[PDB]
Symmetry: C2
Subunit: 304 residues, 2 copies
């Protein structure tokens, strides 16, 4: 709490979509039309989140307000679920298991089993808008990443109830599923109108480059949100874990996390440069996919 | 060169060896001469000292058939010849020859005959494939073929790095090394051979996935830690000691010490996840229990066998 989070210099630049602030208000609008917030709740603490500006970081400049609005809706729904169902506990394990079962039922195009639960309406709306804006994409892969995201959330809840942070290694492993970064990649492909060949996405080099990018993004998020997650007792934070198991001050832990981020950025750049020599050019959809991976890296730094 | 001191690795995982081990050793040589990977009157003492049959004994049950132990020895011997000729040497092979090797070996995995039955590696993989299909009934052949394709791609990556003469980033190497050793294929083959197959609803669970990654990391880093000298002489820069010394500014001794400490930390993490698994809804009872036990088998096998 009484520590100073270092900066992260990453050589990735990107322009923001101009309608960002709009989506902010729209976020609140949607957030009030679904049930995550109700009517006479101050929107200034919610506009300060900047849900629309992050969505602007995730879509092209030449994108529709429909697309930017959908990205804002999805990022707003993720924020409410992660805050309500994971970090507070609180909710019982039976309630969260039912939430997971029912949300996984929505992804199978079936109606929300409890349309009075606000999260059910929210995910149903996100799913219908996503199916309206997408043409050809691997829905099965996204549903699988969502199942693993739910399992990682259950893991996060186990650790939070234990009151202890996981091992740094075990946390790095489970954090890739805990943030749904692969689902983010799949949705960025489906939304922005590009889909790489599965003959490339399954390539080992592309696989490990995706893992490196997800590591950088999620560790940057942890480094920035350490204070907020530490106050709430959310021990699923790499700073928590490094301080706990490696015997470091919270300041030393944050510094080591920043250095690990720098090293992982170097690793990502090395792999990316090696990709063309392996027979994978960053030309067509693969190029846009790598550029979207890079988007989320810079987005975390500049947005946080 | 100078002198390096490989630290020891204490892991609280114990396992008995299959008794027919030494037998398999000789059998390995026999098979290596019956396929073309070994020629006529070549001294078997440098090959028996490898202990390909003893590792196979570490990978199968005590109460297992000589058919099973023999297939395990054949497979571990074929991996050793392929990995040494097609990866670490480049004498050497051209990139086109290795690309043809990969295409043809992946063609064997599609149940087609070896395109070049005079190439010893082709006969070897053909024999391994027919023996594997003879000893297995219902298993994920597709998953193993996918792991073999990624293994071949990681081999191409290893060759790119060796040709560059430079080791990759530690992180980039840890990421690729899991494919460079075919450890997931090893898990799949251990399931298929020893007569157990976990539910895909469990193997796809995130906890099981990351526990598999932890086990593979431990195994591969231990392998790197022990084979650093052999891979350093051969210019094989796909070694975690190489990479840590190169990019983190450490002595080779400091790099080996750092790799050993990372191995210790990853063992701790593996134990933490394994203990957490039942709370997540995954008991270590049926085939999942035997799967976790096989993961532990390879972690101990690396330490004790090397
Ligand atoms: Mg969370
Ligand atoms: Mg949170
Ligand atoms: Mg966070
Ligand atoms: Mg090799
Ligand atoms: Mg080798
Ligand atoms: Mg080695």
């Amino acid at each position: 709490m009484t520590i100073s989070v270092p900066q992260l210099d990453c050589p990735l630049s990107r322009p923001v979509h101009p309608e960002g602030e709009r989506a902010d208000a729209y976020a609140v609008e949607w957030l009030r039309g679904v049930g995550l917030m109700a009517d006479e709740a101050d929107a200034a603490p919610v506009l300060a989140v900047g849900l629309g500006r992050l969505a602007a970081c995730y879509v092209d400049e030449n994108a529709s307000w429909d697309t930017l609005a959908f990205m804002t809706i999805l990022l707003a729904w993720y924020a409410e679920y992660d805050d309500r169902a994971i970090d507070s506990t609180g909710l019982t394990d039976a309630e969260v298991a039912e939430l997971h079962r029912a949300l996984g039922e929505i992804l199978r195009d079936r109606p929300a089993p409890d349309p009075s639960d606000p999260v059910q309406r929210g995910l149903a709306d996100v799913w219908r808008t996503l199916n309206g804006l997408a043409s050809d994409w691997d829905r099965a892969a996204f549903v699988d990443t969502t199942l693993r995201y739910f399992e990682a959330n259950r893991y996060e809840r186990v650790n939070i109830r234990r009151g202890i942070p996981p091992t740094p290694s075990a946390h790095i492993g489970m954090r890739r599923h805990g943030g749904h970064v692969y689902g983010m990649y799949i949705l960025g492909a489906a939304v922005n109108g590009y889909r790489p060949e599965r003959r490339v996405l399954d390539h080992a080099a592309v696989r490990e480059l995706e893992t490196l990018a997800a590591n950088y993004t999620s560790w940057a998020n942890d480094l920035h949100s350490f204070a907020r997650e530490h106050r709430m007792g959310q021990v699923n934070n790499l700073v928590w874990s490094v301080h706990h198991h490696e015997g470091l001050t919270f300041q030393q832990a944050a510094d080591r996390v920043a250095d690990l981020c720098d090293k992982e950025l170097a690793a990502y750049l090395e792999l990316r440069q090696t990709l063309p020599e392996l027979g994978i050019p960053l030309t067509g959809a693969t190029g846009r996919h790598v550029r979207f991976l890079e988007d989320m890296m810079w987005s975390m730094v500049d947005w946080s």
